[PDB]
């Protein structure tokens, strides 16, 4: 099965006594070691349900958004996922007012497309100073819109790396009617996320496993070969 319990060799663990007791229901009895390990059957069930939901939304020709903005690592994970398998992504900080309003971003993305097309058509027919200024403007527009330039409507579903760090983003998502999914840390509300996935968010390796599994969930629905497709073996990749 997907994410076999044997693969969960290092997946559980949380910060020492910083938790909402509403995750007491979705966790093991409180461990003395202050690192409350997790229940594997419920996380397996939730990951499978997320797998099916992503399958369905991809079948109905939908688009999903990826957000990852921790210190150095998760942004790199999302970047590697983006360039590896096609998916809508945001690598830099989610801006206040990025989902509840689209016109203010539709103008920006359309201007980005128009000026990048012009730059492709601009073959030094303008002055070098103005060309460099335009290139800097394109970099400015792309460094906040790293992946949102190919979708022209609202996303049907999206994942969140940390619900306590996309607080504005998740609040805006709950304002609208679209469902959301995230690696729900044990410091949230069991209402801000429609599909609860309890896991670690400060340990890089578990985040790696789950981001890769969800990327595969959206990929295998694209008629694209994947590696975690009911494969009992696993892989070794560590932070540095």
């Amino acid at each position: 099965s997907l994410a076999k319990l044997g693969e969960m060799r290092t997946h559980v663990g949380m910060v020492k006594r910083y938790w909402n007791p509403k995750m007491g229901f979705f966790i093991e009895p409180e461990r003395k070691h202050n690192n409350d390990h997790f229940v594997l059957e419920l996380q397996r069930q939730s990951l499978q349900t997320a797998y099916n939901y992503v399958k369905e939304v991809a079948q109905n020709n939908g688009q999903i958004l990826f957000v990852g903005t921790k210190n150095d690592y998760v942004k790199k994970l999302v970047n590697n996922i983006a360039k590896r398998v096609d998916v809508a992504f945001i690598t830099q900080r989610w801006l206040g007012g990025t989902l509840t309003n689209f016109k203010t971003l539709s103008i920006s993305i359309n201007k980005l497309n128009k000026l990048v097309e012009k730059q492709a058509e601009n073959a030094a027919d303008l002055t070098k100073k103005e060309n460099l200024m335009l290139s800097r403007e394109i970099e400015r527009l792309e460094k906040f819109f790293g992946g949102v330039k190919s979708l022209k409507r609202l996303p049907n579903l999206l994942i969140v790396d940390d619900p306590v760090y996309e607080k504005n983003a998740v609040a805006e998502a709950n304002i609208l009617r679209i469902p959301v999914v995230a690696l729900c840390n044990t410091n949230t509300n069991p209402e801000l996320v429609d599909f609860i996935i309890p896991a670690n968010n400060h340990q890089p390796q578990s985040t790696c496993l789950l981001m890769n599994l969800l990327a595969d969930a959206v990929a295998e629905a694209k008629a694209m070969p994947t590696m975690f497709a009911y494969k009992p073996d696993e892989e070794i990749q560590i932070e540095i």
Binding site: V57, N60, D194
Partner: peptide
């Protein structure tokens, strides 16, 4: 929202 069709 189990179903999506």
């Amino acid at each position: 929202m189990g179903n999506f069709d």
